[PDB]
Design an enzyme around this catalytic site. Structure first.
Site, PDB file in Angstrom:
ATOM      1  N   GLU A   1       0.780  -1.203   0.000  1.00 42.30           N
ATOM      2  CA  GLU A   1       0.000   0.000   0.000  1.00 42.30           C
ATOM      3  C   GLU A   1       0.825   1.272   0.000  1.00 42.30           C
ATOM      4  OE1 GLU A   1      -3.129   0.797  -0.477  1.00 42.30           O
ATOM      5  OE2 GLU A   1      -3.966  -1.186  -0.602  1.00 42.30           O
TER       6      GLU A   1
ATOM      7  N   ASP B   1      -5.985   8.937  -0.216  1.00 43.87           N
ATOM      8  CA  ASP B   1      -5.550   7.895   0.686  1.00 43.87           C
ATOM      9  C   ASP B   1      -4.333   8.332   1.544  1.00 43.87           C
ATOM     10  OD1 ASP B   1      -7.426   6.259  -0.693  1.00 43.87           O
ATOM     11  OD2 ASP B   1      -5.853   5.517  -2.018  1.00 43.87           O
TER      12      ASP B   1
END
Length: 129
Positions: free
Chosen positions: A35, A53
């Site tokens: 990620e 994000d």
């Protein structure tokens, strides 16, 4: 802060993640690797939407936290800005909540792409835990 795999693995283990909601420690660490490359400042903008994000677990500001220009559900009750800090307790508390949704860890696309399909039995073998 950029964590190393084993250092992240120790921190998550210490915070009850190993097996949390049926997900093994290796799974959680693999998700962070892919990620954010273990970076607490990782930040990925607009995106598919408008939103962004944030942090080591790349938590999105339409759903999980509240941001500046992008209004939010704020399920983690927190300003996205906190996830860019070096301490990851808030991030962990929020990831614990994310995984409780029906899609499980599949909420994290990079985990689906880079972890879900993998044999992770040896992923944390170099770690002293």
């Amino acid at each position: 802060k950029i964590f190393s795999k084993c250092e992240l693995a120790r921190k998550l283990k210490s915070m009850g993640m190993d097996g949390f909601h049926g997900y093994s420690l290796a799974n959680w660490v693999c998700m962070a690797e892919y990620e954010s490359n273990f970076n607490t400042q990782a930040f990925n903008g607009r995106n598919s939407n408008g939103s962004s994000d944030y942090g080591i677990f790349q938590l999105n500001s339409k759903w999980w936290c509240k941001s500046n220009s992008h209004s939010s559900a704020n399920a983690c009750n927190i300003m996205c800005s906190k996830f860019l800090d070096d301490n990851i307790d808030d991030d962990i508390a929020c990831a614990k909540r994310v995984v409780k949704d029906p899609n499980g860890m599949s909420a994290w696309v990079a985990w689906v792409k880079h972890c879900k399909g993998k044999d992770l039995s040896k992923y944390l073998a170099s770690c002293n835990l």
